[PDB]
Structures are given as structure tokens and as C-alpha cells.
Amino acid sequence: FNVRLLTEIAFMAALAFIISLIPNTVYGWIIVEIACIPILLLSLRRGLTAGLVGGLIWGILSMITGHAYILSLSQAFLEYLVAPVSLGIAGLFRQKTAPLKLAPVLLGTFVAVLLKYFFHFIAGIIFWSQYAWKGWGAVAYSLAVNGISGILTAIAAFVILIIFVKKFPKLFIHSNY
Ligand SMILES: CCCCCCCCCO[C@@H]1O[C@H](CO)[C@@H](O)[C@H](O)[C@H]1O
Numbered sequence: 323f324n325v326r327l328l329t330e331i332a333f334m335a336a337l338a339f340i341i342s343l344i345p346n347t348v349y350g351w352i353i354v355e356i357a358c359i360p361i362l363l364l365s366l367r368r369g370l371t372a373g374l375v376g377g378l379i380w381g382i383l384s385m386i387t388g389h390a391y392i393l394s395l396s397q398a399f400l401e402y403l404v405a406p407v408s409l410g411i412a413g414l415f416r417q418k419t420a421p422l423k424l425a426p427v428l429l430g431t432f433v434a435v436l437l438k439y440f441f442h443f444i445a446g447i448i449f450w451s452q453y454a455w456k457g458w459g460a461v462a463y464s465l466a467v468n469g470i471s472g473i474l475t476a477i478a479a480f481v482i483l484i485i486f487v488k489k490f491p492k493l494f495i496h497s498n499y
Pocket residue numbers: 348349352470
């Protein structure tokens with residue numbers, strides 16, 4: 323692995339972290355998580371592993387800096403290591419060769435945001451039900467909150483990755499030289 327590779331990885335995690343510090347709350351725990359974007363861009367450009375690891379580092383930064391909501395060991399583990407690591411799955415949709423095509427950017431962005439918010443949804447059932455709206459069971463409450471957060475994060479990720487796909491396509495295609 324290159325010095326170049328590590329550089330990219332570190333930088334994009336620093337970038338997710340810096341972005342996670344922007345107010346992204348729509349209502350209660352419904353968020354638009356734009357900070358996923360640099361990890362997704364990272365996974366698409368350099369593949370799974372690079373992505374899993376950049377997610378890991380983002381999670382660690384959130385926790386060690388105090389910008390993470392932690393209820394217990396296992397909830398911190400599920401939502402600030404597994405969940406951000408899981409965006410690396412987008413790396414399976416990497417395009418090694420030109421021309422760049424939009425479909426795999428969107429299918430990869432979709433599956434990975436979905437995967438991340440699936441973990442939150444599971445987290446939401448186990449650790450967060452004390453906050454459920456009146457009349458709601460926990461599973462329903464977590465689906466609404468994490469389903470909607472999932473969808474809005476994907477929309478944001480799409481808007482942005484689409485402009486990047488249209489204006490700066492070689493971003494998604496690693497190349498030496
Ligand atoms: C899909 C995101 C989920 C967020 C759901 C909470 C609504 C956001 C705040 O707007 C609310 O919307 C209502 C309907 O228009 C208004 O009547 C009300 O005054 C207003 O406060």
C-alpha cells in the first residue's frame with residue numbers, strides 16, 4: 323500500500339469529522355448525515371478496505387473528541403465503529419476504468435447508506451426506545467427515525483455525488499502518474 327493511499331484515507335476521515343460538526347438535525351434524532359460523503363467518495367475511489375478503515379478512523383475521531391453520543395460500550399461500538407466502517411461496502415462498486423458511469427455510484431451510495439442506517443435502526447431499538455414518541459413501539463419508532471434519516475442522507479449524498487460525477491469524474495477513478 324502507498325503513502326499516497328494512507329494520505330487519502332486520513333484526509334477524508336479528517337474531512338468527515340470536520341463535516342459531522344455542522345448542525346444536521348431536521349427533527350429530534352432525524353438528521354441529514356452529509357458527513358458520510360467523504361467516506362463514500364473514499365470507498366468508491368479506492369475500494370472496500372480503504373473505505374472500511376477510513377470509516378473506522380472517523381468513528382474513533384468522533385468518540386475521542388467528544389462529538390459522539392454514547393450510552394454504553396456496546397452501543398458506542400455498534401454506532402461509532404461498525405456503523406461508520408460499514409460505509410466501506412460502497413467500495414465494492416468502484417470503477418477502475420473510464421468512462422465513469424453514474425449507476426454504480428448511486429447503487430453503491432444507496433446500499434451503504436442503507437447498511438449504516440440499518441445498524442442505527444437496530445441500535446435505535448435496543449438503546450434508544452426510552453425516547454419513542456407517545457403511542458409508538460420501539461421498532462416503529464426506530465424505523466421512522468432511522469428510515470427517514472437514511473433516506474435524507476442518501477438524497478444529500480446523491481445530490482453531491484451527482485454534481486461530482488458530472489463536473490469532476492476522475493475523482494472516482496484512482497490513477498497513478
Ligand atoms: C421528513 C422529516 C421529518 C420531520 C417531521 C417534523 C416536521 C418538521 C417541522 O415542521 C412541521 O411541519 C408541520 C407540517 O407542515 C407543520 O404543521 C408544523 O408547524 C411544523 O413545525
